[PDB]
Amino acid sequence: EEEAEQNLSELSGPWRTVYIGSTNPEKIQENGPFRTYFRELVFDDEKGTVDFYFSVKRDGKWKNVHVKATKQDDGTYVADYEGQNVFKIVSLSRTHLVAHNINVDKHGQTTELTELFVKLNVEDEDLEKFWKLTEDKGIDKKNVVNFLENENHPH
Amino acid sequence: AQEEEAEQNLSELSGPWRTVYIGSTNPEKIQENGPFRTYFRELVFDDEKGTVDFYFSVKRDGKWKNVHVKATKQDDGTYVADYEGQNVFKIVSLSRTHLVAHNINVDKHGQTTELTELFVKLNVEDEDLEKFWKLTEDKGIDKKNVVNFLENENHPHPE
Numbered sequence: 673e674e675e676a677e678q679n680l681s682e683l684s685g686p687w688r689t690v691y692i693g694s695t696n697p698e699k700i701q702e703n704g705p706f707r708t709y710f711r712e713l714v715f716d717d718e719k720g721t722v723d724f725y726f727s728v729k730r731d732g733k734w735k736n737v738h739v740k741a742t743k744q745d746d747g748t749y750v751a752d753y754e755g756q757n758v759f760k761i762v763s764l765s766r767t768h769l770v771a772h773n774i775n776v777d778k779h780g781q782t783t784e785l786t787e788l789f790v791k792l793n794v795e796d797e798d799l800e801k802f803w804k805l806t807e808d809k810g811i812d813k814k815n816v817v818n819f820l821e822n823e824n825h826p827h
Numbered sequence: 828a829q830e831e832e833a834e835q836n837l838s839e840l841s842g843p844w845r846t847v848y849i850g851s852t853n854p855e856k857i858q859e860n861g862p863f864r865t866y867f868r869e870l871v872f873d874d875e876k877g878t879v880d881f882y883f884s885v886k887r888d889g890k891w892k893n894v895h896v897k898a899t900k901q902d903d904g905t906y907v908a909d910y911e912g913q914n915v916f917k918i919v920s921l922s923r924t925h926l927v928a929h930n931i932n933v934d935k936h937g938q939t940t941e942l943t944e945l946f947v948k949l950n951v952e953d954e955d956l957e958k959f960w961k962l963t964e965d966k967g968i969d970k971k972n973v974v975n976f977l978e979n980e981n982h983p984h985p986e
């Protein structure tokens with residue numbers, strides 16, 4: 673019985689959007705800039721940054737977007753995306769993230785958003801059980817597809 | 828006496844699941860446009876009827892399809908289901924977060940293919956859901972202005 677050491681960087685990896693709420697419905701409606709499907713998040717304790725990787729559909733087509741947020745002294749984060757954003761992490765753990773974002777667009781319009789995201793965790797022993805079974809059945813490693821990375825890098 | 832009955836309570840594990848890895852003795856079956864290149868979405872276990880409903884997506888002929896398959900348990904402990912032929916699969920390892928399975932498929936030409944798979948569950952805890960709803964209520968956001976991204980038709984394509 674063992675568990676990996678807790679590190680903020682250990683939180684990095686595949687994450688998925690569960691719910692997103694908005695004070696302005698238009699921002700999260702179809703073709704809205706904040707109807708974001710998360711792919712991955714990367715936390716960097718040293719630089720005080722969080723890199724966001726998500727997909728959003730615009731003009732009827734899906735786009736992959738990357739946004740880097742920078743932490744401030746007050747613990748909040750700032751990021752440039754469809755205007756200026758100030759993001760606060762309300763709750764964070766190995767499996768979930770609840771955040772509050774304040775966005776002010778190119779027209780001075782303010783929108784507040786809430787979100788719940790969940791992390792997809794793949795444990796070491798589960799991976800080992802999969803590979804053992806795979807080799808027991810005589811399946812070549814090149815005959816294995818990684819669906820998770822496909823979902824994390826869509827098109 | 829052979830083995831004894833197994834106290835089975837998997838109803839608990841129902842919910843959103845995702846495909847991590849799928850291996851195959853026949854690469855054609857899981858290559859692009861392959862029938863088993865299946866992206867899981869949801870799994871529902873019924874302990875009383877002894878079944879498992881699979882909800883997944885697969886790309887066929889350049890087109891995405893949402894598929895629903897019902898599997899039925901057997902005295903054997905394995906499950907059988909019809910999908911691109913006859914299937915007999917076994918759950919090798921299972922927990923609140925992962926599923927490792929072995930499936931044997933025989934297509935319409937009698938060809939036998941063995942597949943292995945690792946799937947992970949997307950667990951949404953009540954404590955976290957409550958935190959989200961409280962925060963959402965605090966920001967004066969109406970429940971109708973909240974979008975569910977777990978169960979939504981309009982989503983990105985993995986390929």
Ligand SMILES: Nc1cccc2cc3ccccc3cc12
Binds near residue numbers: 706741758772
């Ligand atoms: N700072 C941000 C940058 C890009 C997308 C975001 C999407 C969000 C969704 C819910 C709550 C906060 C969010 C912050 C975001």
Ligand SMILES: Nc1cccc2cc3ccccc3cc12
Binds near residue numbers: 896910942943
């Ligand atoms: N019963 C099933 C129906 C449809 C696709 C499946 C894909 C699988 C992949 C690896 C192991 C078992 C599988 C069972 C499947």
